[PDB]
């Protein structure tokens, strides 16, 4: 039971970490889209 | 010029979709972790 528990925690932390990384990716891509629209 | 715009929009939307999907995975894993904690 304890072993399964550290695995759940360690993996959940990895998912939260990728969410942050993906959020930043969207923000960056969102900005790149704004500049392209105004480059018009 | 027109092409790059739809590509950005299309890909940004795809990132938002993965964010939502990972959000949902996180909730499911957070819940599984709570149930394990109660089994202790």
């Amino acid at each position: 039971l304890e072993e399964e528990l550290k695995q759940l925690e360690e993996e959940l932390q990895a998912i939260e970490e990728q969410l942050a990384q993906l959020q930043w990716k969207a923000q960056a891509r969102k900005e790149k889209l704004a500049q392209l629209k105004e480059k018009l | 010029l027109e092409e790059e715009l739809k590509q950005l929009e299309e890909e940004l939307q795809a990132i938002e979709e993965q964010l939502a999907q990972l959000q949902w995975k996180a909730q499911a894993r957070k819940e599984k972790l709570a149930q394990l904690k109660e089994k202790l």
Epitope: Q13, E16, E17, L19, A20, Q21, Q23, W24, A26, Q27, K30 | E16, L19
Partner: nanobody, 117 residues
Framework: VQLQESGGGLVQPGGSLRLSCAAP????????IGWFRQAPGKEREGVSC????????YYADSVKGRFTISRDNAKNTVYLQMNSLKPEDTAVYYC???????????WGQGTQVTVSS
């Protein structure tokens, strides 16, 4: 709920500032925190971000190497240390529980950063 930005002010090109993001009585430990900025007449930009665990930091390309982001759960504060400022860093800086502006539903007052001689 109600994040408050602080530390902004005036500096000459090349100076430094430490912006603070705090939320009295509301623990940020479990939140992504992101810094944004908005300049006169321009659109709101992402500046930096730090994950809940603090295991990961992200930086706008333009600010890479000058700014550093950090967090201390004990003081319930996230910091943005800004070195080597240039006049293009002048903007109102904003704090949020997300790196992605579109996730943010409430914007603070921000704190004003003006850099010029």
């Amino acid at each position: 709920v109600q994040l408050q930005e602080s530390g902004g002010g005036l500096v000459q090109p090349g100076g430094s500032l430490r912006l603070s993001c705090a939320a009295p009585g509301f623990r940020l430990d479990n939140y992504v925190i992101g810094w944004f900025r908005q300049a006169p007449g321009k659109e709101r930009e992402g500046v930096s971000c730090i994950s809940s665990s603090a295991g990961s930091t992200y930086y706008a390309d333009s600010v890479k190497g000058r700014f550093t982001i950090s967090r201390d759960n004990a003081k319930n504060t996230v910091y943005l240390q800004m070195n080597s400022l240039k006049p293009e860093d002048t903007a109102v800086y904003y704090c949020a529980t997300a790196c992605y502006s579109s996730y943010v539903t409430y914007w603070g007052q921000g704190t004003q950063v003006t850099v010029s001689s």
